[PDB]
Ligand binder design. Structure first.
Ligand SMILES: *[C@@H]1O[C@H](CO)[C@@H](O[C@@H]2O[C@H](CO)[C@@H](O[C@@H]3O[C@H](CO)[C@@H](O)[C@H](O)[C@@H]3O)[C@H](O)[C@H]2NC(C)=O)[C@H](O)[C@H]1NC(C)=O
Ligand SMILES: *[C@@H]1O[C@H](CO)[C@@H](O)[C@H](O)[C@H]1NC(C)=O
Lengths: 180, 110, 123
């Protein structure tokens, strides 16, 4: 399976614009990931990381994005917050693994890397694995509005990038390796 | 827009009372919750919250205060009204911006 | 969480008045701040909110463009600048915030409004 292609990718999207890579019809080697020091966080929900090699799935979805370290914790079931509610939500259910690493020497810059954005205003929260990449000036009561007039605010903001690259493996023809 | 009833509640000391609040629109928010709170303003004092999220009470609030409701129709209930309960009971909705208050119900002790 | 209003006065229609509100018992910087006014005409009327970072300012249509909400975190003080005052603006102005900032983002800072000051009269 094309795991390295996702984790060691040279470019990641914003959280609000998280990208979904589908893994299927392949052998999922989780040993490289499991005991590597690449990741600062290796969190699985109801799934034993050690046993990932022994689990078969219809498919695996690797959701890729860059989020400030502080908000990495929002990428989990049962969470609230600007990211959990407006940028990228995980369902209240079992989950595969949320894998993340520090990217201060990759994505962060001395003046702040503001190429990455996030949502903070929206007419309601996001559903689990919903992607909202629209950019229409926010209006608190559904009215038409034009910025920078009063009550007219852009729903998106910029990240003051320390950033972490996060890849979420959501589990639904893919299995781990066999040993000869 | 919130409308309360009665405008004024004549309750004998030691007897129960209830204050109604009716919204022009459902106060259920996008996350499924309902942000309908109740406040009491005692003469000479500012408003204080008693009940929140329709039926929950704040710490320090007497157990005699409770409530219920859904959609547009909400009620604040007082199991027994004491002399110290004199004041104007307001309902407030935060579900739809701008947040609004009712006109308030003046509860007095007879 | 205590809020203390000041700056109330009698001001002729067309003129301006600036209110202030000192905060104590909590960290001012960590909460959004609101102004609410009281009058027989309106009961309790929400006017404006300024977010914790002082960036987003939302106003009720009834004051939108006439009132400006601002804050000085360094002084733990909330302000309200009211220009072109009318007779209809006569009210007791309350400084309002929240104790619970678990969800410190729009619109969740309108959900509790559980912290009120003593209020100051503006006429
Ligand atoms: C992203 O790419 C880096 C390398 O560019 C991967 O880190 C490297 O992964 C290998 C495999 O586990 C680590 O072990 C190496 O194995 C070869 C096998 O012959 C051996 O010759 C090497 O001396 C070494 O033992 C290697 O130490 C490791 N390097 C570092 C700096 O960690 C990384 O795992 C990739 N990330 C993902 C998520 O795949
Ligand atoms: C990490 O996985 C590799 C797979 O070849 C294994 O050989 C290695 O011993 C593992 N490391 C530990 C400490 O289990």
């Amino acid at each position: 399976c094309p795991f390295g292609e996702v984790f060691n990718a040279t470019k990641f999207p914003s959280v609000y614009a998280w990208e979904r890579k589908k893994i299927s019809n392949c052998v999922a080697d989780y040993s490289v990931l499991y005991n590597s020091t690449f990741f600062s966080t290796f969190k699985c929900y109801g799934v034993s990381a050690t046993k990932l090699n022994d689990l078969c799935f219809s498919n695996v979805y690797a959701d890729s994005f860059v989020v400030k370290g502080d908000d990495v914790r929002q990428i989990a079931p049962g969470q609230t917050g600007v990211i959990a509610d407006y940028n990228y939500k995980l369902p209240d259910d079992f989950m595969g693994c949320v894998l993340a690493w520090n990217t201060r020497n990759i994505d962060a810059t001395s003046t702040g890397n503001y190429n990455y954005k996030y949502r903070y205003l929206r007419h309601g929260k996001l559903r689990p694995f919903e992607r909202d990449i629209s950019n229409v000036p926010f209006s608190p009561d559904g009215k038409p509005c034009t910025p920078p007039a009063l009550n007219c605010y852009w729903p998106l903001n910029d990240y003051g990038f320390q950033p972490y690259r996060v890849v979420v493996l959501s589990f639904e023809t893919v299995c781990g390796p066999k040993l000869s | 827009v919130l409308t309360q009833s009665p405008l004024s509640l004549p309750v004998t000391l030691g007897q129960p009372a209830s204050i109604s609040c009716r919204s022009s629109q459902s106060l259920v928010y996008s996350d499924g919750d309902t942000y309908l709170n109740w406040f009491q303003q005692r003469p000479g004092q500012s408003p204080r919250r008693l009940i929140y999220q329709v039926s929950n009470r704040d710490s320090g609030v007497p157990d005699r205060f409770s409530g219920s409701g859904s959609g547009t129709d909400f009620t604040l209930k007082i199991s027994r009204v004491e002399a110290e309960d004199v004041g104007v009971y307001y309902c407030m909705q935060g579900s739809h911006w701008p947040p609004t208050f009712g006109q308030g119900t003046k509860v007095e002790i007879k | 969480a205590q809020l203390v209003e000041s700056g109330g006065a009698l001001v002729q229609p067309g003129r301006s008045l600036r209110l202030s509100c000192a905060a104590s018992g909590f960290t001012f910087r960590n909460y959004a701040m609101h102004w609410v006014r009281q009058a027989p005409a309106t009961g309790l009327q929400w006017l404006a909110v300024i977010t914790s970072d002082g960036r987003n300012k939302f106003y009720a249509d009834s004051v939108k463009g006439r009132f400006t909400i601002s804050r000085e975190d360094s002084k733990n003080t909330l302000y309200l600048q009211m220009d072109s005052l009318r007779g209809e603006d006569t009210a007791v102005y309350y400084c309002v915030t929240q104790r619970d900032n678990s969800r410190d983002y729009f619109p969740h800072y309108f959900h509790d409004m559980d912290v009120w000051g003593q209020g100051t009269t503006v006429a």
